[PDB]
Scaffold this motif. Structure first.
Motif: not given
Ligand SMILES: Nc1ccn([C@@H]2O[C@H](COP(=O)(O)O)[C@@H](O)[C@H]2O)c(=O)n1
Ligand SMILES: Nc1ccn([C@@H]2O[C@H](COP(=O)(O)O)[C@@H](O)[C@H]2O)c(=O)n1
Ligand SMILES: [Zn+2]
Ligand SMILES: [Zn+2]
Ligand SMILES: [Zn+2]
Lengths: 154, 159, 149
Positions: B13-17, B31-36
């Motif tokens: 997912x692409x998300x803010x922050x 935006x950036x990529x969401x992950x662990x």
């Protein structure tokens, strides 16, 4: 040294009133795929036909002899035709994409089934598992996708 | 001789922050990529491809989603460890090819840098590493800019 | 021996009223693929897989219809010192039926690449009514190519 590569793609809808069978493994779940709809085996089957340049799974095993045959039997029949074409299977890699259920505890079972059906050592068969990160129809759990790659040699 | 092929797939997912990191390249974007981990979609797909070719399972088995050490982990470090384990299994990497799919931002200006990062991490010459950038032609969640997908293929040989 | 593998992906929207060309074959249909070129999704994917295997980048890096571009791709691959061993591919389309046109596609690809027919394969799939492909909003193609230096 006459190597050939093949690639495979399959997807099926996830619906109630069907068993969930992936890599020949019946996985307890509220829904199953709409063949036994074994998405992993079909993708591997397509990749093998592709590597041997023999067409695709729909052409070999249509909706017209193979009625009631499960996807493990179809895979064995695929391997046979690949061998008759004069090719030996070198390795298979694959990915299943499902948001749910968890597939990791079933990976080794899947590998053993595929290896047995292809008459391959375990160390030449690989199966990987991914979610779709809640994205798209896969991420919303509407279906399950499988991708496959196979290397053969004449 | 004993060649093996592998394939890899990833999506985030692409998300803010979050920082946008693809192929080890930090890309200016809101935006950036969401992950662990740092969620480097391209390096994860390549990683999966390499484990797959060597029949070593997958990225999740080797670098668990539920470990605080892999929280915000450098995926370049993960790629290098992957390469190390493939070598320990007795395989040499012959080539990698890959695709990245995003509606935005433009990735073409960053492909050369990504390729250089991958080549360095795998100890490969540049001419054995390829990265292709694509859009999804306005279709699906990728077209709506909800996330980014990567695909990879790797060829190895048992030495 | 110096084998290399490549993988290709392409997708285009189905719109009116453009012609539907896949694998260089015009297929009777009410819609057709939208692109800057003829938008031949199969040939684009194969083209990218070949550039990928030879590590020459992608189509949108080097560059006439898709068949001419596939011919040019084959030229650059050979220029780099690679011979093409095999291509495999999959077209994903809910509609129309692709099976009748598969062998023509394959003939086109084999000719453009100077390969015998038994080193070229094209497979067709539906998307089981899932996503934009399942609603017939677009057509995707996937390809894999093996080359040797
Ligand atoms: N658009 C399409 C999609 C699939 N097909 C054929 O129908 C067969 C069955 O398709 P699926 O298994 O994707 O449902 C395929 O093997 C392919 O040969 C077709 O002729 N035209
Ligand atoms: N359906 C799935 C999807 C992923 N997983 C496992 O969890 C780990 C994390 O999944 P993802 O990498 O897709 O987020 C994966 O490597 C995978 O092996 C699973 O067990 N079942
Ligand atoms: Zn299927
Ligand atoms: Zn990832
Ligand atoms: Zn295209």
């Amino acid at each position: 040294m006459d190597f050939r590569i093949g690639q495979g793609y399959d997807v099926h809808q996830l619906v109630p009133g069907r068993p969930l069978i992936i890599g020949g493994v019946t996985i307890p779940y509220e829904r199953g795929l709409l063949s036994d709809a074994d998405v992993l085996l079909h993708a591997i089957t397509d990749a093998l036909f592709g590597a041997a340049a023999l067409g695709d799974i729909g052409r070999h095993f249509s909706d017209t002899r193979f009625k009631g045959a499960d996807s493990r039997a179809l895979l064995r029949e695929c391997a046979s035709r690949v061998a008759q074409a004069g090719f030996a299977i070198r390795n298979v890699d694959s990915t299943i994409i499902a948001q749910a259920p968890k597939l990791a505890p079933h990976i080794d079972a899947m590998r053993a089934n595929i290896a047995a059906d292809l008459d391959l050592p375990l160390d030449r068969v690989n199966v990987k598992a991914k979610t779709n990160e809640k994205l798209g129809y896969l991420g919303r759990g509407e279906g399950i996708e499988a991708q496959a790659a196979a290397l053969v040699v004449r």
